[model samples]
Target chain A: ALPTPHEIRNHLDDYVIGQEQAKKVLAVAVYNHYKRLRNGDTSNGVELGKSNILLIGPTGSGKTLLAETLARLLDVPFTMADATTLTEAGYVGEDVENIIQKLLQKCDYDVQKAQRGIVYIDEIDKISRKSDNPRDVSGEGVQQALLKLIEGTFLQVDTSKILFICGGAFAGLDKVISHRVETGSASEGELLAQVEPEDLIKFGLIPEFIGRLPVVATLNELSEEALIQILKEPKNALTKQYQALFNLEGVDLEFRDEALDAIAKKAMARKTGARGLRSIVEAALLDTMYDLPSMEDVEKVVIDESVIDGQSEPLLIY
Target chain B: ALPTPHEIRNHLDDYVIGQEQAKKVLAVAVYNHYKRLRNGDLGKSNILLIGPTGSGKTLLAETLARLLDVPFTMADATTLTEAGYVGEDVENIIQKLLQKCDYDVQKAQRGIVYIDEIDKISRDVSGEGVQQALLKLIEGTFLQVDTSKILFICGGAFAGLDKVISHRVETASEGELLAQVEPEDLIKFGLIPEFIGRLPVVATLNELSEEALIQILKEPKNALTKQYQALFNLEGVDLEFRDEALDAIAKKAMARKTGARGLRSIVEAALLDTMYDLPSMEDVEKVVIDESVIDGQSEPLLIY
Candidate 1:
């Protein structure tokens, strides 16, 4: 019995923040995918193909994190692999079969269990035809090789039941969308709207691969508010982790509210999303981290805005 | 034998339009690294290039790659994080190089690995961990394979670094303008001291001025206009660019301020309609791109 999509989404909300559209699409896909696995959904007399998913977003926008959270919520076996390293069968790079090997390992060599698991192919955009230009045949052969796996292939292993999620930032994809819009004579107001499947196709994804990934869910770039929430709101908030680390040494650590806001401002400037939070916190506390261990019986460490601004004196209590 | 510094820079001139400073810095770095490997000269260190987005940091490394005989791979540092973090481990950077050499460990050890978006490495728990992870490789490391001879070059736009530079320059006196850029400047930008220390030679690239932008469109052998000419040539269309049309393209590119990165976009936007319609239209053997076509006021002139 699979949890309802709503319940699965509730589980995801515990970890990932503010990808409402992506969360909804993933929740529905997971619910429907599990339903198919339990009994061949013959309600429609015709077999519906697997609804493989394609995730598009910028770097550090939680594409991988969202997939990992979905896997955790399902309690299903999951394996992550990179698509950039994959080549056609005879090439020196990884083969498509290696991903299956990874899945098998994830399920402890239980082929039946592995079949029911999820396989996340990250950096999938790397496999698209190298150029959008006329002369580009970039990775057509590689895309051709993936046709079997996406549509369910077998080689001493059955991956028909596995859910495949492909994710990439698709760095230059916005250009494709812009190009599409420019040709349409659409109003400036209508420009820069949501991503369409046609945009991906124009951006060099093969028609066959696009067909397999019937569900395309996009994540928005993290906002300043969302990132601030990430630093304090998540179950494993970075601030909480740092506080706990200092608590281990019997030193009470307090980060002023202003300090947290200042830290978030600096992190946002880096454009790496939640990834930047830890670095900003680490730098503000770098001196404190090195000094606290040396001082005799430090009782309290208060990080203030002045400390962050490099204006105030050291406030470590001795 | 590796080519001389002048030879490498001369080779780069064919494709790259401008940035003489960037080309000279990279050519010297490549020449010396190979020279050190071959001749055992005392000065041995990796190169770090800093620039603005759309500047020629990646372009410089790429041109070097085309000219060099060694196996080369361009990797985005943004895709990598510290081990035990969410992203790909930094160790895989080396593995990618090895794979590039067709699994020849000996050849792989001497390859060039160019990592872009390096300024993204910041000051978090995982961020410092990533720099520590890179420390071994940036110097020399023995992991799955030996990296002693590998000449590593890392680049980043260090986005928002201009604010830091402007602030420091404003605070400093007139004579101390050059001293504004130092290792400490990068450390202030969130790089660990040890990480900055490892990259011995540093080069900074300038934003492309409007003239440089226009030069990029016209002068380079692989210029955007030339690529479009080639694209239409396949359709048996002789595409001619008016002088004004090139300036319009460069003007749009300069306004975008994304540097050379935006040139292809503007060119493609201007040509998309003509490219789509001309292949099927008969008697369109000659397509002339004049001023009005660029201004969106008229269609491209078609000559039978």
Candidate 2:
């Protein structure tokens, strides 16, 4: 039986936190892709068109995590390739088809399974179309080379059965949208809210590459509340991970709710997503995590707002 | 003649801004590094820079180059690949520096070559390929040139490296003592031990504050507002920024939390319309940028 979008999204919730809109869009797309795979390609006379997903968000917005989570839920092969280091077809940079090489390598060289995998090409916005530089090697040349693999066909490894998820931060894209819209004193939030496919192309993505990625899902820059939820709710919650490490050394680790909130707020200020949470929490606890093991009779450690504020050290109970 | 650290710091003040400690450390290190070129063997001269992006790492290197008045080359370490990999050759790093110096191999021999994102090359293939490739260049052993006179300053953001550094017993005298960085922490952060061995001196740039950002806009010689004013001055128009206008820009940039790097983007966004239209308005003698103009709530006031 084919899983419904709800079921697919429910599976994603186990691993990924927010981006509800993105999860719904990708859940339906994944269900459709897998449904077609199961039903033998018989949907009336309509062409079985492929609409690869484009994941767009700022750093730490879970763009990578969302793609990885989707592949995990589907239990399919997944490979990640960066677009920045890849140059034009003949240049010294990585070949566009090397993404397939990565997939094949991941699937243990089993061509059949590799063909059915999900390939995530990150930093896709780095492949510039025209950055006002003529001798741009990492720009239009790579875009032209990528056109065939993304939309139509590949030379060596076939992408006909594969799903491509391309993600990028696309810096300055909001400005492009802001300029194209009604020329007025539109607020920053309004400009970001109105970002559309046209703005993306205007920001240097080739029209052809934009067209291939028909299923576009954007994750919002995380708010403090969303980030706070991320710290407490996710299966791999950072606090839980840290607690596990302390438990192994016979130390009981305790974190006040206030500390978690403080951690989330600091992470939000860093303006990267949940990725920043681990860093702040890790930095705060590094002292205790290291010294607690050697302490003669330390039993329980309490982390509170003082630890987050850098006002006082974490209290230890012997 | 070698300039004293004070003279060097004052020269650095003209172009680079902020992070007083970072600037002072870099200024003194650079003075010694160049002094060795004039004289022989005082100390191992290279210094490693560690900071988040846009805290002026590249700008400091450029300023040092300008002061040295010598041919300088900068490259991102990520561009260099592991040996037997399809990437930039280890030999090419020096070759590019030499090229920058008009192929005057002798001039290039004494210049500084700054390598950035050094931690990028540490994660793959036992991290030995590029490090071995650079062992000679960094250790003054590369046979092709008189390497001792050359300075190899490698730096990187080394994202989340604080986690590694904070783990040590540096906290023992913590509440008041000066903080220190251990190279072993860098090894944990993915830089190979051998590369850390070469960079004798290390300095870090702290995060820029909102107040610091405001100072950056108004105080620095190359402040964005100053540049914009000078740009408009090039045409016959006088551009003036209201006090609130600078505050607004600083607030916006701080919201982005990307440090001084995001300052230009915010300034450019606010001035985009003014920059496009001021050229066409013939009678405009001066433009007053106020809080409203920066907030996108009102247009710039034009003075005839």
* TM-score for predicted model 2 compared with the true structure: 0.50
Identify the candidate with maximal TM-score. 1
Clashing pairs in 2: none
DockQ, all candidates in order: 0.01, 0.01
Cα displacement (Å) at residue A274, model 1: 38
Return the lDDT, model 2, position B149: 75
**Runs in model 2 lying further than 4 Å from the true structure:** A1-318, B85-88, B170-178, B282-290
Which CAPRI level is candidate 2?
incorrect
Residues B1-304 of candidate 1: C-alpha lDDT, one tens digit per residue: 6798899989888777566776788889888888888765555568888776666776777678768867776655544554454233466666556655767887787688888778887776776677777777776664467776888888887766666767766634321332246787788888889988888778777766778777887777767667556545545677788877777777766554445655654664466456544534666555445554467767777788
Candidate 2: residue A187 lDDT (0-100): 55
Q: Interface RMSD computed for candidate 2 is what?
A: 21.8
Q: Across residues A1-318, which tens digit of lDDT does each residue of candidate 2 receive?
A: 556667777888887777776787777667656655555444554245364888878889888888898888777889898877775544432366777877888888777677668988888877765443232434555665565676535336677778888888877776776676664465544456455555676677754566577667777888788777787777778767877888788877787877777887788777877878888887888777777777855555545645567667787787
Scored against the native two-chain complex, candidate 1 gets a DockQ of: 0.01
lDDT of 1 at A287: 71
For each candidate, what is the lDDT?
0.70, 0.70
TM-score of chain B, candidates 1 onward in order: 0.86, 0.87
